[PDB]
From a paper:
The structure of PaDapD was determined by x-ray crystallography in its apo-form to 2.95 Å and in complex with coenzyme A and succinate to 2.3 Å resolution in the spacegroup P41212. Coenzyme A is bound in this narrow cleft formed at the interface of two adjacent subunits. CoA binds parallel to the trimer axis with the adenosine moiety positioned between the C-terminal domains of adjacent subunits. The pantetheine arm lies in the groove along the β-helix of two central domains and the β-mercaptoethylamine moiety is facing a cavity where the succinate molecule is bound. Binding of CoA to PaDapD does not induce any large conformational changes such as large scale domain re-arrangements as indicated by the r.m.s.d. value upon superposition of the subunits from the apo- and CoA complex of 0.55 Å. However CoA binding causes a disorder-order transition in the enzyme. In all structures of PaDapD that lack bound CoA, the last 15 residues including an α-helix, are not resolved in the electron density, whereas they are well defined in the PaDapD-CoA complex. The crystal structure of the complex also contains a succinate molecule bound next to the acceptor arm of the CoA in the active site cleft, most likely due to the presence of 0.4 M succinate in the crystallization buffer. Bound succinate interacts with residues from both chains that make up the active site. The position of the bound succinate corresponds well to the site of the succinyl-moiety in the ternary complexes of MtDapD and EcDapD with the co-substrate succinyl-CoA or its analogue, succinamide-CoA.
Numbering used by the authors:
A (entry chain C): 3 to 245, 251 to 342
B (entry chain A): 0 to 245, 252 to 343
C (entry chain B): 1 to 245, 251 to 342
Write the structure that this text describes.
Amino acid sequence: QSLFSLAFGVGTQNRQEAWLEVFYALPLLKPSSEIVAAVAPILGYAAGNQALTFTSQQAYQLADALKGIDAAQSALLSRLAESQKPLVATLLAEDAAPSSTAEAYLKLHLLSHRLVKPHAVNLSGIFPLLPNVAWTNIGAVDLAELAELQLEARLKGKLLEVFSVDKFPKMTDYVVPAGVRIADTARVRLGAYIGEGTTVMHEGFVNFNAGTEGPGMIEGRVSAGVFVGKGSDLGGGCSTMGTNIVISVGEGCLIGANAGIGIPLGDRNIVEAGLYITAGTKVALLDEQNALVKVVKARDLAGQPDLLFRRNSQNGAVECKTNKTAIELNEALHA
Amino acid sequence: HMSQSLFSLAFGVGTQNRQEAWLEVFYALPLLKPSSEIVAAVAPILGYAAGNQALTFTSQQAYQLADALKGIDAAQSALLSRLAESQKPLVATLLAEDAAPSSTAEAYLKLHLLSHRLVKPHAVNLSGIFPLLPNVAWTNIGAVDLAELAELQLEARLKGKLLEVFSVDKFPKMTDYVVPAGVRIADTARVRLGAYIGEGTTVMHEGFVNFNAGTEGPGMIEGRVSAGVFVGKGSDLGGGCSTMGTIVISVGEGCLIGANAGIGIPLGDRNIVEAGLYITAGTKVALLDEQNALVKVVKARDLAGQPDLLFRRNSQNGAVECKTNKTAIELNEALHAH
Amino acid sequence: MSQSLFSLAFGVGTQNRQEAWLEVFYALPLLKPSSEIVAAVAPILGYAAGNQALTFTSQQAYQLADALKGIDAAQSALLSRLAESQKPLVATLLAEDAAPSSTAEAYLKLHLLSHRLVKPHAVNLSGIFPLLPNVAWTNIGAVDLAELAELQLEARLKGKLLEVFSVDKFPKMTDYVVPAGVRIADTARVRLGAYIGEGTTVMHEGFVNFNAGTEGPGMIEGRVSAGVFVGKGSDLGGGCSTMGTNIVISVGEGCLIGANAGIGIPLGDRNIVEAGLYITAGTKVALLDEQNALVKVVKARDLAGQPDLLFRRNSQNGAVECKTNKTAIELNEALHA
Ligand SMILES: CC(C)(COP(=O)(O)OP(=O)(O)OC[C@H]1O[C@@H](n2cnc3c(N)ncnc32)[C@H](O)[C@@H]1OP(=O)(O)O)[C@@H](O)C(=O)NCCC(=O)NCCS
Ligand SMILES: CC(C)(COP(=O)(O)OP(=O)(O)OC[C@H]1O[C@@H](n2cnc3c(N)ncnc32)[C@H](O)[C@@H]1OP(=O)(O)O)[C@@H](O)C(=O)NCCC(=O)NCCS
Ligand SMILES: CC(C)(COP(=O)(O)OP(=O)(O)OC[C@H]1O[C@@H](n2cnc3c(N)ncnc32)[C@H](O)[C@@H]1OP(=O)(O)O)[C@@H](O)C(=O)NCCC(=O)NCCS
């Protein structure tokens, strides 16, 4: 049939031939049947979701087969043929729970290349498929081999720098999508979706299966599964709750420095610097005269546009200011 | 008028992309107010007529310049000798005046001046700098143009290596150009070129200092110093505190901004902000005399620049308070005197 | 009378142009090394007594590897590798856990912490700061600050970069050790001397100072200051703060410190601190019984160390409250015991 995706990767394996990591230069969403046909026989692809290793020699064949069908992929395989490191071609018939490390990595590539958006792809059971790895200046290094390599570097007056020890590498070591800034790339995980015109500042962080439509200024934390709409700004040190109700931020929102949200934010919401709006926070909802409409749980204001959340600096009450009348607010609360 | 006495000059080695756009320039020994002797020796070889200039120059010219400066400035001469061997492209940037920058090379020089501490935040004209500072991939092999990156990432992978991309931004990190004396910076990813880190300052891991910002020194920085924010002598910014971006926010001498707190106003000398409190410009504050009685309720904004304030949030009634050691008459004078 | 040592380790390190030690790396540090090891090794090193950082030669390295052949295979193998080294070697033999007296020793004690051979507060780190020189931590390793500018220039001349990722007295831990069963998202944020317990994951916003850390397991996404130890199964939410240092702050077992919150007191077991709340020691808290009636207004300091407390700020009246599943009578007894 029509495949969901395919990509030709170069990766790394440990001493026991386990896959630590795979890099895909040119992943494809819904590749053309012409490409799949030409490639399927050579790789030994029958059906379903497969991570198929292949050889330098098979690389040259595949390069030739795709000459004249897709120039881009052919030139990639031609480079892949000179590779010292092992090769995998992962071909996915369906968008399903991943079954291999190679597939898990491809699906995170699809997100970070912006082929698919957060929540558009199945990442169920990915965690056991992503091995904990030492991310170093020489690449991924298995934790069982690391101490030895660290010693040998020191003997030569050198340093094996270990900049991360984790199941997810940092995105920019695999892709930097167009029209994006990321001040400290240590803080954006492979699998993050950084929309065009987004700038993630130093205090900003974006988990996998999360990100920004773009444009936007991210200076706080976007947790797994959180997606931030168009033109929204997250101030320095702000928090977006993780972990059911998914957290999102709408369009044109402003989340203040050091503040936080545990509810989904509707469009053009503002949260005061320093304010943490928890799902069960009891909020004094105010109409456009700043008169109490009623006290509600923050959870119940989820998705409503044009709210300003603030903590009253004289009586300590968390207040939600609107430009709507009481009868309007009550209507919104019940539909 | 004829050729002047310059604002700055520096000999730099930088990096260009395939279309010869400058990504980046490194100046080892930048000069504030260089002597007329240095300029007179160098100008004819560089072809510097007047004003503010980013003049590319050759290896041969580098030797010529080293010779001309021999016996005028030993340091500069020696640098030019080294520069003459370089593989990378050279630029001499001579600025007659401190004006809005007109080139990437000039932009980079002005950020160096700040980070070498030759000038302080706000003393230098940085207007319109963003469009001169191209977005670049800062990698372990240096600056790399974004259109050239994906290719280079592939080639490293094919050799079993990694092209590490530690930052994608218009500003590189300062310490890849300068580490000024008497300074600690725990995670250097968090101090931009253009930051001024004063002697005896320590920037901890959670600390951050933008361009055109920083510390007099000494001090402990563990929160975020936004662009244009200067922190006096002996002031401490607690872990994860915030200073608001952008009128001008500053911090006086001897302040303590609590962990996870924040300021949207200039804090006068010896102010204290309680851990967890965000003092917003429009925050309504209970100003209290000694004896802790209410003087009026003011906007935090009207307390800007006042010394010896303690800011706190009453833990029993939620009121943001400013405690003072002053009478109602004293406070009246401090807030309203002409 | 020569003793039975607190610690010993063979290190390879880096010196500046004035032969001052910037840094030492210990591959396999020993806690309470056997008398058999100390006896084979001491005459070659010239160890006499006490706490000693003893430099040694490549030839001495071979001798030591030969002496420990058939006593401790691992140490012998290490010494054989050290014999090939281009960098200078030191053997640090510590008779006692005492205030450190050398850069070599200060580094060993932090190694002991990070290998998890000892726990935070179990080791004497008194006066350590003067022993740990401020160093530029680069991609080529430790560099003296007086030599750095020159090396920065030379890299630029070759179109390369001398990356300078930290300028500090403490390097990052993972450049020395990655202990088993641990995840650290951004390793710039865990210092040598951190104790990161098995099953701990330190996310990107997490930070752990020296002489601090986690029993394990747990999720650390906030700041663990020096001298702060966090019990089994406790979660520190994103950007939470743990006050620095005379009450020593600690977090008990099974606690939840919310995102952007903070503690200036020790937290007893199974405590919860609402997201965004900072609880300082002088913070006045409304202590509520299992029926949510006011029992008493107390300073948070006096609730420190009690189990099963939920700290929250009342979103309607601004009062910092502490909720419990105990009666007024049980609570008053705890405040008076
Ligand atoms: C919440 C926020 C948006 C409100 O500011 P605002 O409404 O735009 O501007 P103002 O301060 O003029 O608001 C008007 C009134 O609210 C009052 N006010 C503001 N915050 C208050 C509070 N927490 N409690 C009581 N009154 C408050 C002001 O004093 C003023 O009173 P007035 O009507 O008697 O003049 C702002 O204070 C804030 O927190 N912004 C966050 C920005 C940020 O953190 N990051 C962006 C990138 S740095
Ligand atoms: C704001 C701060 C300075 C107040 O503490 P302080 O003035 O040093 O000393 P205390 O805590 O003893 O204050 C004295 C009184 O005020 C009370 N108090 C303190 N904070 C209060 C609050 N927020 N609401 C009501 N009462 C409070 C104390 O209970 C005590 O009451 P008492 O007069 O009945 O005995 C402090 O709590 C703080 O937040 N410091 C920030 C440090 C930090 O975050 N980082 C530094 C880097 S390690
Ligand atoms: C404080 C906290 C623990 C309370 O949550 P909870 O008790 O488990 O769940 P609930 O929301 O049902 O709380 C129960 C009651 O408290 C109320 N409540 C919660 N916070 C309140 C507040 N600050 N002021 C007043 N009421 C509050 C709820 O409305 C609810 O009221 P009800 O009994 O009238 O229906 C939670 O809000 C919190 O801060 N969690 C921190 C988690 C975090 O930041 N990170 C975890 C790692 S991702």
